[PDB]
Design a binder for these strands. Structure first.
Lengths: 316, 185
RNA sequence: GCGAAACCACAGCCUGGGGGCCAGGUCGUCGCAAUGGUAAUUCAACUUAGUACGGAACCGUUGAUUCAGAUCAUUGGUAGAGCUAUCAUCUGCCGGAUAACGGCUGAGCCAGAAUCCGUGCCAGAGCGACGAUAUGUAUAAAAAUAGAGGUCUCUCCUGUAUCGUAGAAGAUGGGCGAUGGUUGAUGAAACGGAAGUGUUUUAUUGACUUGUCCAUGAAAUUCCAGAAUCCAUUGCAUACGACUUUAAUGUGGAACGGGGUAUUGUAGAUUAAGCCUUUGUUCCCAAGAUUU
RNA sequence: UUGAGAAGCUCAGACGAGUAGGCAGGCGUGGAGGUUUGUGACGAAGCCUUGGGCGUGAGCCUGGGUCGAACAGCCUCUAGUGCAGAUCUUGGUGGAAGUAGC
RNA sequence: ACCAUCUAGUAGCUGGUUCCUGCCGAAGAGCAGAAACUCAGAUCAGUUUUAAAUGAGAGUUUCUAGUGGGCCAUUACUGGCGAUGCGGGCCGAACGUGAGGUUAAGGUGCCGGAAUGUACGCUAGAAAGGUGUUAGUU
């Protein structure tokens, strides 16, 4: 069938089969968000919509929290279009690296002599002309620019300190515009909240939650309704129009098996494949949907911050 | 005259005639490279080869024009034998013209040309368009790359012709060319 | 630890035609996509509209049926957690080419179906980027055969052409004429990304030069032959492997001591176990073994 | 001209599938008689051998290794004389299989 | 029931039956040989002409083995299969070991040895329908 045969995704990150259709007319931006499937909450969204049956009805549905905020944007990777497919013309990151990125590039970072990009960083810093020449070649030859972007696994609260690198292509913008955006975002921390507000239907993807002797299969939640960005660092993660009072998206006393996300989440009204702390692959829709229901935003009135583990109703 | 490596421009050639010419060369110990395989031509209307392929679709089903020609040569060789498999490895059929091959002379096979073998007005199909309809999706970029190579090669020809003008003028300038021109050179 | 026996021409990929015959089927990171599978389905109501002509239809809107993929915020079940419920929730598209059929000029085009192929989704066999470590192997425009190129004019009608081609397998010298040609080694700068691994411009250095004409030598070869893994550790994972983690002197982790957290429950104990979390404590630390 | 093992030598021409079946000539084994002034501890027989040779073949000759006591050619005699099979007889040894199993 | 002889009980039957080369060779009374005789000055014939041509040397008495199936095809006959491999895929061809030459059948785009030969033509291919086509008749 479509999803059949069943096969758990070996890669923790939900490698996107496709990406949103880039267009040079649109500003140089991204079309992905590195979620982490933090948890869920009954974010009551008052669906203020005349004609609809659930007019102004608070939709107390699961706001599937997915930790997604500042993710280390290292550099860019060239991608030239070839008669045999899409070939990576080059891969030029920024001079500045991170221990999490180095840990990701290896498997025994502490055991290893931290040689990851040792001379490469020196070449990037000292031989900047060579980096510029390669960048100039990338801008003049590569058809697409895959903006390299790691994660904040070591930065945000997580046992894994291997930054989830993602070759997020520059969604839109010309070759010069994509290079300039990559240069601006060189050695930066791409914030998922900055990329998108997560206040409407999204194209979140990623592996499912490993049940046992299945799950953990790469999926793509089409038209995944996103309630709001669950900023775990901010006390107002679950604070909404009616709830407010600096409510925390995590359950009172910490979410089950995920606690409180050290950074912003991608809390989405509905389901999201993946267990607690399992890295998600939220992204923009490849196609376009001008549906009135999708266009109309459901006003998030209240939310749920109950100490679900235990007294599933004790919000405070 | 035979040599070790030949590059054949497959445009305007019939599939069967060119493959049969290629197969006989391969079994003779000659390494053969066929370029621009998506410009190959097939006798008969488009639907005829189209129903032939979809019948084949109804074994690995390969859509690329270069691998369409490769199958044609393969059936014309003793593939079940070590001799045939050795010959097949000597054939490099590619679509478009790779840069390693666009700087070398390309020969054509008169016994396989469509102009010399098809009556005028006869309907004929193109492998590239047929492949693009059965699943191949790279003809846009292949065509675009063809224009860039053709433009670059055209500039090279103009530069070569401009350099040729000087020596051509200097040919008759030297009186030796007319002193003993009776030798026929 | 002990330990048979029956049986065994020979052996074990499919289709067709006449089980073997014939013809076919270094490590690691980030990516590419050959190919295979594929998915959505139906109905009701409202607005159209009591209108067009008793009574529609286009569009739009609101919802339901079946099916598919996910999730456990809430509710129920299970003995708080976890699991789970068409008992709970979320999600489930647009391009091309078409058939019937209707048109355009008069074959070649247009319109056209829940059909077909793609977009998308699922799997990833072949590959990409990045990090640390052989007899002279000569010849590059495009498109047409019911036309092209170059400057109203000219050429094509194959390469039987063009470049290089004499030297004891390429020796040793002299003169005449031009600033040549062929190069080996340095120094460079411009170009080539589709598989660019090659194109030039050169500034030198070291050679040869048959461009031309002369001077010596060939012989008896006397007729061909610094990482990864194990141990340990993590639970986003788990039948076991595998995976995610850390894990090799510091948010170091591992353990507890816990706190918080709740449950049941009448406040208490468990107190994360797949509840959180710790300015708390101690322990130990590539430690060895193993493969490249 | 020597070229009569007259059962020898020499000339010519034609011909060549083959089951049942018929005819002929040969190869081999155990023992017998005769014979080779036969072979043998300076190594018989046997066995092994990608060593060599002869014959269309059955088969024979031989080198080397191993071995340690007998053997063979030729002319006749004789027979318990020639094996791929008989779910052959006897012995030995396999795959099944370190499986089923205790 | 058992045990030992009779017993190597009873065979139209089952399974098996051991070296080589050569020559002849069926059947599917006849067909095959051996001796003996009588022999180009002799008779014959899977033959044809006429109401002789041509090929072959012709026969006899005697014995002594094997078989008296069936199948295919053209017209009960005729062949062929069977005891028969080889080239082609029924057609061709009757076989000692070889060298060379040349062919039959079938073939010469490639697999595949061999002309992507030459020339003339039509357009899936190796009861009647069609405003599909090409040559002609009335």
């Amino acid at each position: 069938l479509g999803f059949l045969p069943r096969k758990r995704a070996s890669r923790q990150r939900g490698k996107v089969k496709a990406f949103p259709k880039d267009d040079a007319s649109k500003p140089v931006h991204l079309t992905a968000f590195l979620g982490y499937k933090a948890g869920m909450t009954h974010i009551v969204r008052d669906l203020d919509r005349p004609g609809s049956k659930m007019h102004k009805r608070e939709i107390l549905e699961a706001v599937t929290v997915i930790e997604t905020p500042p993710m280390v944007v290292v550099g860019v990777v060239g991608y030239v279009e070839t008669p045999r497919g899409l070939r990576s013309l080059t891969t030029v990151w920024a001079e500045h690296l991170s221990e999490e990125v180095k840990r990701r590039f290896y498997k025994n970072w502490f055991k290893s002599k931290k040689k990851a990009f040792t001379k490469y960083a020196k070449k990037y810093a000292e031989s900047t002309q060579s980096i510029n020449r390669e960048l100039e070649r990338i801008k003049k030859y590569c058809s697409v620019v895959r903006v390299l972007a790691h994660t904040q696994i070591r930065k945000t609260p997580l046992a894994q300190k291997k930054a989830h690198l993602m070759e997020i292509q520059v969604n839109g913008g010309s070759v010069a515009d994509k290079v300039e955006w990559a240069r601006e975002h060189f050695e930066k921390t791409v914030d998922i909240k900055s990329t998108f507000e997560q206040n409407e239907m999204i194209d979140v993807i990623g592996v499912t939650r490993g049940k046992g002797n299945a799950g953990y299969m790469h999926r793509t939640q089409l038209n995944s309704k996103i309630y709001r960005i669950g900023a775990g660092d901010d006390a107002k993660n679950a604070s909404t129009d009616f709830d407010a009072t600096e409510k925390r998206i995590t359950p009172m006393g910490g979410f089950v098996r995920y606690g409180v996300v050290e950074n912003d989440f991608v809390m989405l009204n509905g389901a999201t494949p993946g267990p607690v702390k399992r890295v998600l692959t939220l992204r923009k829709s490849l196609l376009t949907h001008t549906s009135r229901k999708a266009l109309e935003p459901v006003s998030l009135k209240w939310i749920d911050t109950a100490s679900k583990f235990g007294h599933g109703r004790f919000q405070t | 005259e035979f040599q070790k490596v030949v590059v054949i421009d497959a445009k305007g050639h019939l599939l069967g005639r060119l493959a049969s010419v290629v197969a006989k060369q391969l079994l003779g110990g000659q390494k053969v490279v066929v370029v621009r395989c998506e410009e190959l031509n097939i006798s008969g209307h488009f639907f005829r080869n189209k129903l032939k392929y979809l019948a084949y679709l109804r074994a690995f089903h390969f859509r690329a024009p270069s691998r369409i020609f490769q199958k044609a040569v393969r059936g014309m060789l003793p593939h079940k034998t070590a001799r045939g498999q050795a010959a097949l490895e000597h054939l490099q059929a590619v679509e478009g013209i790779p840069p390693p091959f666009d700087k070398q002379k390309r020969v054509v096979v008169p016994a396989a040309l469509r102009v010399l073998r098809l009556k005028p007005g006869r309907k004929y199909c193109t492998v590239g368009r047929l492949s693009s309809e059965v699943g191949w999706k790279y003809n846009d970029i292949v065509a675009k790359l063809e224009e860039r190579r053709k433009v670059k090669s055209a500039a090279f020809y103009q530069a070569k012709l401009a350099k040729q003008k000087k020596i051509a003028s200097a040919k008759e300038a030297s009186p030796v060319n007319q002193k003993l021109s009776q030798f026929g050179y």
